[PDB]
Amino acid sequence: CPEQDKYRTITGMCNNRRSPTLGASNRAFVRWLPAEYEDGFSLPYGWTPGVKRNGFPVALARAVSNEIVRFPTDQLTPDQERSLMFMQWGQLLDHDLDFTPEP
Amino acid sequence: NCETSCVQQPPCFPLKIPPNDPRIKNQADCIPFFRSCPACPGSNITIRNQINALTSFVDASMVYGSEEPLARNLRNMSNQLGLLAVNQRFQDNGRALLPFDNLHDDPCLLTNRSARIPCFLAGDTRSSEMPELTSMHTLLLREHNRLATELKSLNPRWDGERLYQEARKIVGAMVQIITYRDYLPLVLGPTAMRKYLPTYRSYNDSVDPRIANVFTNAFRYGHTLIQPFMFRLDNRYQPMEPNPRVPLSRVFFASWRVVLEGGIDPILRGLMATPAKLNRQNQIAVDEIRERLFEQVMRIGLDLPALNMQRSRDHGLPGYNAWRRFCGLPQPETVGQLGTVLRNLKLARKLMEQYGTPNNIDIWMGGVSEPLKRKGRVGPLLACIIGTQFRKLRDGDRFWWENEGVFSMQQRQALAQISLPRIICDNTGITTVSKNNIFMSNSYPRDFVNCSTLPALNLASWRE
Ligand SMILES: *[C@@H]1O[C@H](CO[C@@H]2O[C@@H](C)[C@@H](O)[C@@H](O)[C@@H]2O)[C@@H](O[C@@H]2O[C@H](CO)[C@@H](O[C@@H]3O[C@H](CO[C@H]4O[C@H](CO)[C@@H](O)[C@H](O)[C@@H]4O)[C@@H](O)[C@H](O[C@H]4O[C@H](CO)[C@@H](O)[C@H](O)[C@@H]4O)[C@@H]3O)[C@H](O)[C@H]2NC(C)=O)[C@H](O)[C@H]1NC(C)=O
Ligand code: HEM
Ligand SMILES: *[C@@H]1O[C@H](CO)[C@@H](O[C@@H]2O[C@H](CO)[C@@H](O)[C@H](O)[C@H]2NC(C)=O)[C@H](O)[C@H]1NC(C)=O
Ligand SMILES: *[C@@H]1O[C@H](CO)[C@@H](O)[C@H](O)[C@H]1NC(C)=O
Ligand SMILES: [Ca+2]
Ligand SMILES: [Cl-]
Ligand SMILES: [Cl-]
User: Fold this and answer.
1) Coil vs helix vs strand at B255
2) What is the CATH number of domain B1-464?
3) In whole angstroms, what separates CA B314 from the centre of its chain?
4) Contact, B179 vs B418, CB < 8 A?
5) What is the DSSP string of A44-96?
6) Strand partners for A83
7) Nearest CA in chain A to B19
8) Residue extents of the structural domains in chain B
9) Contact between residue A33 and residue B321 where contact means Cβ atoms under 8 Å apart
């Protein structure tokens, strides 16, 4: 970790001099709340048939999408005060902040 | 193979099909899903957590990369001009295109079997997911090279490395300025903007700049803004025939559409002059992403909203009430209570029927269900999560553009003049762009102006 620098490293390493991996790539996300897993440490809610979450059955993600999200495309409301550039910058910005790898 | 199996065996967590599904009639089928990579594989001690492959900083890592071998490979190492590599086979009206990736399994090649146009190569791996995203990546690639050229003429003594780093530093700062000056006030609204992003003071080394796991799901509020088409417009901002409105399920990974169907200028024009979809409590997200996500590259169309919910479960995220409590917001315990919070009883009833308790509503679902804050495009819960994250990325970044020693007083005064419309003017054939604010401006010609009226970035204070 150098004492003086002019530019960022590529990995983000050394931006924070006391904890130099903070904000650096290929590290665990920070958690703002403790995780909630079916077994308390790894299995996701909905993994085991019949296992309730806080006294209630787990809703299928596809059922929630079908019942709450689904709407007729013809009904779409254009936003009078936002461009599609507002949507595109969001995804572009997201791609500067996080990418969660999969196997 | 998660791609073709419906068996729930690690690392597969396939989405099951409910009875009476409007699209998938085979209840023995599933929507494929791979669990995110664990930070500590196989552990029975640690509480499972996920990995961020990118730098959390608003540092244009989607342009330069977050890993050193990739960052080297994206650079033009054939000279000392400090430029990023450009496509060697194709150009866009004599302007740079991103280089192609040398992928073994290229999804872009399946979008048009005859075109044979592979995926692009950028700082972030997802650069080809939609041509509108590709266009923004191309725009920034051109802006780096334009800056690296303009700095070489000012300082001929500077080598490659110095030119690359100084242009990288400017690009990084432009992304920060556009994000915090123009984008975030329009996401959060003015009250949440003052609450979570008060006037910048200085760097604070005790502010943790990491991305919070919840942010990866909460920032997916953008899925509610997505239009079911990619809109392309000519130099007169008129529908570019043929196919001026291509369905989204026909643009995913279609890098060919950028090479063979007009370059990035018709795409950028469509982004500027078309309104975003508005999030409404009974119009949350379109079927192009809810039914037909990536359908021409896969065995089945996916459901992005459903994927978001399965992902929040994969990540072990607490439910809606726990996040409302984290934010210091009331926690509805029932359908009547949720009705009040949402100012929408029909929506509360639908949520409760699915979840049983607001304690179990998945963070994305609950977040996008909330009524929007005045002049914002998120409710109180998402404004809190998003605002808290961006304050940490700003106060926790040693290389934040306004931090003492990053830039000089003069360089900062010069940087304050930048805008995304001016970036579009300096790197495309577009002569008529959106008036500031580009994220608000959406009607041609009412909200459009001429490039000549827009001030350029004065690099005089960079002379050594
Ligand atoms: C540099 O930034 C530091 C981080 O600041 C946070 O992040 C930025 C982005 C802003 O959002 C900011 O508002 C955030 O606070 C900042 O240090 C922080 O300073 C605050 C205030 O001094 C600290 O809060 C105190 O915490 C102690 C310890 O308990 C905390 O942690 C436990 C465990 O997580 C929790 O269970 C607690 O609820 C707390 O969160 C508390 O004892 C203390 O409260 C008591 O005292 C105050 C008056 O002193 C009373 O009003 C209360 O009622 C209590 O009796 C505070 O809540 C915070 O811990 C600290 N964080 C870190 C990481 O050090 C620093 O001040 C900034 N510096 C400058 C110059 O800007
Ligand atoms: C062209 C528009 C967009 C997509 C196509 C698209 C697609 C996805 C997909 C498939 C994911 C991964 C889904 C999963 O969990 O399995 C995804 C992740 C995230 N998005 Fe999406 N997205 C499009 C558009 C947006 C916009 C406009 C967003 C924000 C304003 C946005 C954000 C995100 C983020 C941050 C994630 C998580 C990224 C990560 O891995 O950490 N998306 N989106
Ligand atoms: C795939 O891309 C090709 C271009 O490479 C498109 O082909 C053109 O199609 C039109 C009619 O639709 C013809 O007039 C052109 O002569 C074609 N060009 C070539 C080179 O074949 C084709 O339409 C695209 N395919 C799909 C499915 O969209
Ligand atoms: C490197 O720069 C030169 C000069 O601008 C250019 O002609 C060449 O194509 C570049 N190489 C790559 C791989 O971009
Ligand atoms: Ca970054
Ligand atoms: Cl979290
Ligand atoms: Cl190439």
Assistant:
1) coil
2) 1.10.640.10
3) 21
4) no
5) PTTSSTT--BTTBPPPPHHHHIIIII---GGG--EEEEEEHHHHHHHHHHHHH
6) B275
7) A63
8) 1-464
9) no
- Pairing state between β B275-277 and A78-83: antiparallel
The bound ligand whose nearest atom lies closest to the alpha carbon of B111 is 3
Q: Please tell me what DSSP assigns to residue B453.
A: G
What would the two tokens of residue B171 be?
Answer: 């690009």
Q: Which of B224, B221, B218, B223 is nearest to B326 (CA)?
A: B218
Q: How far apart are CA B289 and CA B269, in angstroms?
A: 22
CA B410 to ligand 2 center in whole angstroms: 38
Q: Considering only CB atoms, which chain B residues are within 8 Å of A56? A: 355-357, 360
* Experimental technique behind these coordinates: X-ray
Range of A40's domain? Answer: 1-103
Whether A54 is catalytic is no
Cβ atoms of residues B209 and B397 within 8 Å: yes
CA distances to B176, B429, B433 from B457, in Å? 15, 18, 17
Q: Tell me if B154 sits within 8 A of B459, measured CB to CB.
A: yes
> What 8-state DSSP symbol labels residue A16?
S
Q: Is the peptide bond before B445 cis (omega within 30 degrees of 0)?
A: yes
Residue B52: which H helix or E strand, with range? Answer: strand B51-52
Q: Using CA atoms, how far apart are residues B176 and B183, in angstroms rounded to an integer?
A: 10
Task: Name the domain count of chain A.
Answer: 1
Give the resolution value in Å: 2.3
Q: What is the spatial distance between Cα A46 and Cα B170, in angstroms, rounded to a whole number?
A: 46
SS3 B404: strand
Mutate to test the pocket of ligand 3, among B109, B112, B250 (most ligand atoms within 8 A of CB): B112
Q: Quote the CA–CA distance of B226 and B247 in Å, as a whole number.
A: 12
Q: How far is the CA of B119 from the centre of ligand 3 (A)?
A: 19
Are the CB atoms for B256 and B112 separated by under 8 Å? yes
Residues of A in contact with B319 (CB under 8 A): 36, 53-54
Choosing from A4, A6, A95, A99, the catalytic residue is A95
